[PDB]
Amino acid sequence: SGAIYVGNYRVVNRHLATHNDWANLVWEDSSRDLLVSSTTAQGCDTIARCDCQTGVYYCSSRRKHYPVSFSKPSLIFVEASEYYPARYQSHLMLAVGHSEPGDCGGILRCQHGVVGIVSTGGNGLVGFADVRDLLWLDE
Ligand SMILES: NC(=O)[C@H]1CCCN(C(=O)Cc2cccc3c2CCC3)C1
Ligand SMILES: [Zn+2]
């Protein structure tokens, strides 16, 4: 579990979005596993606007943060699950690292700010849904 709070927006994994997220829907993209809802309070997270390929992510299944090198946002095949049929998920970045299903929503950060959130994993890999291209989150 986990979310990003920036301005009047809340960014969560689309498969974990609540009834309130869907009732206050701003934008969602099944292919990115992302959903943005509107909030009443002002969020304080800063979004990175860069092309960093190193950062640190939060791993709930270990209660630890880990440094990682990660790939650039790309189309990657994601195995079948209880939330989606087998498909290509876009704007996804992979890293070698520990991850378990309940790890979705853990934030990835670089020196510039929030890069993305955990969205896929397994076999000693971890995948992050990128948010750096969503320039509207800041206006
Ligand atoms: N984006 C998707 O299609 C996901 C939808 C929810 C289900 N999902 C996974 O649980 C994949 C997975 C396996 C093993 C470790 C981990 C994960 C996610 C977090 C770390 C994939
Ligand atoms: Zn950066």
On whether both 79 and 11 belong to a single domain, the answer is: no
Are 59 and 107 contained in the same domain? yes
- Is the CB of 103 inside a 6 Å radius of any atom of ligand 1? yes
Distance CA 111, CA 114 (A): 9
97 with 124, same domain? yes
CB of 37 closer than 6 A to ligand 1?
no
The total of structural domains in the chain comes to: 2
Shared domain for 29 and 65, answered yes or no, is no
Indicate if ligand 1 lies below 6 Å from the C-beta of 119. yes
Query: Residue 5 C-alpha to ligand 1 middle, in angstroms?
Result: 22
Q: Is residue 63 located within the same domain as residue 35?
A: no
| 21 & 79 share domain | no
Q: Are residues 10 and 70 in the same domain?
A: no
Ligand 1 geometric centre to CA of 35 (Å):
16
Strand ordering across the sheet containing 74-78: 64-69, 54-59, 107-110, 113-122, 125-130, 87-96, 74-78
Same domain as 55, residue 39: no
Q: Which atom of ligand 1 is nearest the CA belonging to 126?
A: 20
Q: What is the DSSP string of 17-51?
A: --HHHHHTEEEEEGGGTEEEEEEEEEEE--B--S-
Binding-site residue positions for Zn(2+): 50, 52, 110, 112
Host domain of residue 24: 3-44
Residues sharing a CB contact under 8 Å with residue 103, sequence separation 6 or more, in sequence order: 59, 60, 61, 118, 121, 126
**Resolution of the PDB structure in angstroms:** 1.6
Does residue 56 sit in the same domain as residue 20? no
E-strand stretches of 1-139: 4-13, 25-29, 34-44, 54-59, 64-69, 74-78, 87-96, 107-110, 113-122, 125-130
**Which ligand 1 atom is nearest residue 99's CA?**
20
**Residue with CA nearest ligand 1 atom 10:** 101
Q: Is 106 touching ligand 1 by the criterion CB < 6 Å?
A: no
60: three-class secondary structure by DSSP = helix
Shared domain for 118 and 63, answered yes or no, is: yes
